[PDB]
Amino acid sequence: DKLALFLKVFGGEVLTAFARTSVTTSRHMVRSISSGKSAQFPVLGRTQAAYLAPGENLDDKRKDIKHTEKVITIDGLLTADVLIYDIEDAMNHYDVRSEYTSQLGESLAMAADGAVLAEIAGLCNVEGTATVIETTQNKAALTDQVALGKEIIAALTKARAALTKNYVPAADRVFYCDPDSYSAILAALMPNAANYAALIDPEKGSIRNVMGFEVVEVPHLFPANKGEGNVKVAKDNVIGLFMHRSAVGTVKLRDLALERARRANFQADQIIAKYAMGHGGLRPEAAGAVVFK
């Protein structure tokens, strides 16, 4: 009854608290399904429109490609929720519900950050096709803000060149970047220069297309240890990780779901959201980084 009405309202806030805040909902394909617990999407062998003379209908390059498309399915459930002490939620209004929704949204954003990064990183160090473009000389020679951002741009240019080299389209290609040290990529471009308009963003927190791709910055300074040991893509040794649209995969189950109950052990009230089905899946290309070594 009344609890029921109070809920539905809570669920709507949670959905928005997610959609508002994330590194995602973009920068990848997503879809809906019903009791299918799986999914499929095509990758890109690209395509173009050549001069066509009806002495022949080519349908040829399409033979010589031999590139299939790896569908996927949902593995496990990613959601987590919490325990409370009940009384406020009915009635009152602005303070309590509003306070809970934001935290849930933050949690959703963190979850979104966790999965995509992992799928990309763990795709291939494993032997574009692979990744590595590094140079920069092992961080030891240069700790300086000026000494960074120069050598960083060149690596990105090299990566774009490799991409034409390995093809794939170039439009929205990403380059997720670390939370910091891009102060260099700031402090490199324009010295002095308050200037922080121009180089831009509304509606999001990005920067604009320096040497292709774009700039998004996040936490998560995949193997949390291994320096090389075969596979190169790794923990703190690693920066970069530029992937591209539709190189990865996931699905939904439904819009969302949640329910509540009580557990005598911790008493009063327990809210849980069974929702956020999708697990990231990565298709090779793009997906490359720079470490130090």
Residues 105-144 binding a second copy (CB under 8 A) are 105-111, 114, 144
For residue 34, give every residue at least 6 positions away whose Cβ sits within 8 Å of its Cβ, in sequence order, or none: 254
Of 80, 106, 100, which Cα lies nearest the Cα of 22?
106
Which of 117, 133, 155, 186 is the binder for a second copy (CB under 8 A)? 186
What kind and span of H or E run contains 188?
A: helix 183-189
Least gap, CB of 116 to a second copy (angstroms): 14
Residue 269: strand pairing partners:
84
Told to check if 195 binds a second copy by CB under 8 A, we report yes
Of 176, 187, 140, which Cα lies nearest the Cα of 288?
176
127 versus 187: smaller Cβ distance to a second copy = 187
Least gap, CB of 254 to a second copy (angstroms): 13
Least gap, CB of 143 to a second copy (angstroms): 8
The two three-digit tokens of residue 143, written as one number = 């700790």
Contacts (CB under 8 A) with a second copy, residues 238-277: 246, 251, 275-276
Least gap, CB of 233 to a second copy (angstroms): 20
Contacts (CB under 8 A) with a second copy, residues 210-229: 210-212, 217, 219-221
DSSP 145-177: TTTSSHHHHHHHHHHHHHHHHT----SS---EE
DSSP 270: E
Identify which range of 3-11, 132-140, 145-153, 222-230 contacts a second copy by CB under 8 A.
145-153
7 versus 111: smaller Cβ distance to a second copy = 111
The backbone torsions φ and ψ at residue 38, rounded to the nearest 5 degrees and listed phi first, read: -155, -170
- 30 to 59: interface string for a second copy, x by CB under 8 A: xxxxx-----xxx-xxxxxxxxxxx---x-
Say how far apart CA 82 and CA 270 lie, in whole Å: 6
Identify which range of 87-95, 125-133, 233-241, 280-288 contacts a second copy by CB under 8 A.
87-95
